Design a binder for this molecule. Structure first.
Ligand SMILES: O=C1NC[C@H](CO)[C@@H](O)[C@@H]1O
Ligand SMILES: [Br-]
Ligand SMILES: [Br-]
Ligand SMILES: [Br-]
Ligand SMILES: [Br-]
Ligand SMILES: [Br-]
Ligand SMILES: [Cl-]
Ligand SMILES: [Cl-]
Ligand SMILES: [Cl-]
Ligand SMILES: [Cl-]
Ligand SMILES: [Cl-]
Ligand SMILES: [Cl-]
Length: 836
């Protein structure tokens, strides 16, 4: 791209527990815990009872060192920068006897001019990582109260003093692994004249006819003379130039601000997943001096995103308008993919986005107890058409608000805003998760003096109502900011539900039935959720067979919700027969979470436009654990993820039964209206015999972006109470010429009340490298079938579905570990098998 040379400092590192003088090979980027694990100096932290056994690490200081060679020629370049994309967290950086930096914020990248400190030949880099526990003990002692951060799993809630990923201190689905290290890459750049410090592509306006952009460059010139230069911006699409602009300047020593307008006529818009292609242009900025001394590019999506948050007849709306069209949000809350962040590989990020795209999602919330994610995450969101709701990294406790603390926060806000603001995917900023809710409703006023409580309330405003919104206004002026989620609505207070976004924890924490999701509607659901144990192959990863009990010491290790096991059983009993065996209980628990949650996803879509989105808690897991996730740590889809896919389908037939009556809604997130449609239904018993006749509803239209009721019928006079326990309703939607565009099945009774027949699911299999193809058959209904295989992360065309009587079903399973001539073990489970 330019004349600079980059040296990756990613080999030859060593580490030491401070004070031991013993050094061993390390892997950078990485973590202290991983380095110890790689030397068998820690047990597998995710196995068994090992959490307590690895806590000692957090009390030690840890040192890292590397050496590297610099040549006479490199030392003669105009400038040389050492760049740390991430240091976790209190890190003193020494090079060649100079203290370069005292780092104090995990979320900040540092760029350090070092030419004057480098030497020809060998150069020595040492980094000292202070324990973030020891570092903040004096700070806590001076504070005179303990912040109410219940998720910080220690007597002393030290997390709040450090700009370090909150979840690292523990969470209610998380292991405590308060780690340290060089967590993102370290690079040396040797260059001439200048670097581009920042390149911002600011969209001024966008119409079907024209996109107007402002290319804003910050150029840091390292030489003392004045340097004539030409700044060039090339805009290309698929390798073909669309427009090119240039500007003559004379670069002054230090910072230069350069602005170049560019326009794209008849722009091809970036669309979100479901509404078209996520088209990305390539914008390249170069600085040319007589040689291209500096270049930087971004992929750019041309679209408008407006968050509409306005007083209205129902309270206060909260929805996303994309390219001028209101878009119903369908997605999930994302947490960190690992207890050890550098262990998350490119392939894991790619697979997680494939999981979101395949489940018909169009939005992800990067929840405030994790990290501002790596550039790759947002690059994947851009190319998959997934909108990103970005929390700042504050969650579930008030935080300090003293000048030094706020200076750290300002540093991370500026850094990460400039880092992320060029992504098409980035849709909004949110100051924190649940802090105002906590301050108002979680009973802190009983835990603190009135004076300390007042201090907390004032401190909330300084950070979330002043500093963060001001920073967004300055650096990302056309993106929405809200101070907290949920900003006003509280789940126990019905009068607040028509006001902005909800975290409806009435289900789960409030013990409310899943049916409450049909009546208790938000303007936008930013969280709701339900736990499940992950499937047996995941349990087997952390537990020996002796430990396969809900309440074994090892299982309780991997359940961080102290009320979770009791809630799961309570809810299961409402709808299912509780199985006697642990393995069957796990299977039904997956079914339960899937069925209950999808009932909610369907209510939210059905109630558009009153409700304009749903983001369930939670997408994913950081380690093998019992949690609210739809995908376990090993990437296995739980039932919930298949159910989410189905409930988020662009066109959905939603039968909803209440008060002994059935309505059927047709729900569409398509941009086009469907005309002359037929809804066809029929009642089929569990033996496959049709009851009565086919019901047909002709001449239906399904307008773009609407939910509409097309059919209502009382059950009384149609089906006997006996019919209701022994049959299901099949529903199909077809176009004028008879082609199927959607299908659904409906049960008229709770599963535990169904008279399911004993039945065998037989299968045929054709296995080749990487692939099994199964054909399943049962002469009778098999309810909520789970096709279980021992291969971690195996992918299925479908799973957790009802196998209908006499209706053959093909299922493809893929995994790089499937070998032709090593038959894939397959175990098919279904509800009736779970009891006698
Ligand atoms: O934002 C949140 N809401 C509820 C989750 C489960 O208790 C919790 O893990 C998360 O902090
Ligand atoms: Br320099
Ligand atoms: Br220090
Ligand atoms: Br300037
Ligand atoms: Br969509
Ligand atoms: Br605000
Ligand atoms: Cl610099
Ligand atoms: Cl408002
Ligand atoms: Cl107090
Ligand atoms: Cl229903
Ligand atoms: Cl009913
Ligand atoms: Cl059976």
């Amino acid at each position: 791209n330019d004349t600079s040379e980059v040296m990756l400092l990613d080999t030859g590192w060593e580490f030491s527990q401070s004070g031991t003088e013993k050094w061993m090979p390390a892997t950078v980027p990485g973590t202290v815990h991983q380095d110890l694990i790689s030397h068998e100096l820690l047990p597998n932290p995710f196995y068994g009872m090992n959490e307590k056994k690895i806590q000692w690490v957090e009390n030690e200081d840890w040192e890292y060192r590397t050496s590297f060679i610099v040549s006479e020629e490199q030392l003669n370049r105009d400038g040389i920068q050492l760049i740390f994309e991430g240091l976790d967290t209190y890190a003193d950086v020494y090079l060649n006897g100079s203290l370069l930096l005292k780092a104090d914020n995990m979320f900040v990248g540092y760029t350090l001019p070092v030419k004057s400190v480098l030497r020809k030949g060998e150069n020595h880099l040492y980094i000292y990582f202070h324990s973030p526990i020891r570092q903040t003990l004096p700070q806590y002692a001076s504070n005179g109260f303990n912040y109410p951060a219940d998720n910080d799993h220690h007597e002393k809630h030290l997390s709040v003093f450090s700009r370090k990923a909150p979840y690292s201190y523990g969470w209610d689905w998380g292991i405590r692994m308060v780690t340290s290290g060089v967590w993102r890459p370290v690079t040396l750049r040797f260059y001439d004249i200048a670097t581009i410090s920042d390149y911002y592509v600011r969209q001024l306006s966008l119409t079907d006819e024209n996109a107007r952009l402002s290319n804003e460059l910050i150029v840091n010139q390292i030489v003392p003379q004045k340097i004539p230069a030409e700044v060039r911006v090339n805009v290309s699409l698929n390798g073909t130039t669309v427009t090119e602009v240039k500007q003559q300047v004379t670069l002054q020593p230090g910072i230069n601000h350069i602005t170049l307008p560019a326009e794209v006529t008849n722009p091809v818009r970036w669309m979100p997943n479901g509404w078209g292609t996520p088209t990305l242009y390539d914008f390249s900025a170069q600085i040319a001096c007589g040689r291209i001394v500096a270049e930087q590019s971004h992929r750019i999506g041309l679209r408008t995103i407006r968050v509409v948050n306005e007083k209205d007849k129902d309270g206060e709306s909260f929805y996303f308008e994309v390219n001028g069209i209101p878009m119903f949000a369908k997605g999930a809350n994302y947490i960190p993919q690992d207890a050890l962040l550098p262990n998350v590989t490119t392939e894991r990020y790619q697979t997680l986005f494939r999981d979101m795209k395949e489940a018909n999602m169009n939005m992800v919330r990067i929840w405030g107890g994790g990290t501002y994610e790596n550039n790759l995450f947002y690059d994947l969101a851009d190319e998959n058409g997934i909108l990103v709701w970005q929390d700042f990294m504050f969650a579930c406790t008030p935080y300090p608000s003293d000048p030094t603390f706020l200076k750290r926060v300002e540093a991370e806000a500026v850094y990460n805003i400039r880092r992320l603001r060029n992504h098409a995917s980035l849709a909004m900023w949110c100051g924190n998760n649940e802090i105002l809710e906590a301050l108002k409703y979680w009973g802190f006023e009983k835990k603190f003096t009135p004076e300390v409580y007042q201090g907390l309330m004032h401190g909330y405003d300084k950070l979330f109502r002043e500093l963060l919104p001001s920073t967004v206004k300055e650096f990302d002026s056309d993106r929405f900011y809200v101070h907290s989620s949920p900003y006003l609505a509280n789940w126990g207070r019905p009068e607040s539900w028509g006001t902005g976004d909800s975290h409806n924890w009435g289900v789960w924490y409030g013990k409310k039935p899943f049916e409450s999701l049909d009546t208790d509607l938000p303007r936008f659901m930013s969280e709701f959720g339900f736990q499940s144990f992950p499937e047996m192959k995941t349990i087997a990863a952390f537990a020996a067979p002796e430990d396969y009990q809900i309440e074994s010491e090892v299982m309780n290790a991997h359940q961080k919700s102290s009320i979770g096991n009791s809630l799961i059983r309570t809810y299961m009993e409402r709808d299912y027969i509780i199985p006697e065996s642990f393995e069957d209980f796990v299977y039904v628990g997956l079914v339960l979470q899937g069925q209950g949650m999808r009932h909610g996803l369907e209510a939210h879509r059905r109630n558009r436009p009153y409700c304009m989105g749903t983001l369930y808690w939670q997408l994913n897991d950081s380690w093998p654990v019992v949690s609210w996730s739809s995908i376990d740590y090993y990437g296995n889809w739980k039932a919930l993820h298949y159910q989410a896919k189905r409930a988020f389908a662009p066109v959905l037939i939603n039968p909803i039964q209440q008060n002994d009556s059935l309505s059927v809604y047709l729900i569409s997130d398509r941009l086009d209206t469907m005309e002359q449609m037929t809804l066809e239904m029929k009642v089929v018993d569990f033996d496959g015999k049709t009851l009565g006749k086919k019901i047909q509803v002709h001449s239906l239209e399904v307008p773009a972006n609407t939910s509409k009721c097309v059919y209502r019928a009382k059950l009384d006079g149609w089906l006997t109470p006996e019919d209701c326990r022994r049959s299901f309703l099949k529903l199909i939607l077809k176009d004028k010429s008879g082609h199927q565009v959607a299908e659904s099945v409906h049960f008229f009774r709770k599963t535990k009340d169904l008279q399911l027949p004993p039945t065998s699911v037989s299968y045929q299999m054709k296995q080749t490298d990487g692939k099994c193809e199964l054909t399943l058959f049962s002469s009778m209904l098999a309810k909520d079938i789970f096709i279980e295989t021992p291969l971690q992360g195996a992918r299925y065309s479908d799973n957790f579905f009802d196998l209908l009587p006499g209706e053959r079903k093909k299922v493809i399973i893929t995994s790089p570990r499937i070998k032709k001539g090593e038959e894939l073990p397959v175990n098919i489970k279904h509800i009736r098998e779970t009891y006698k």
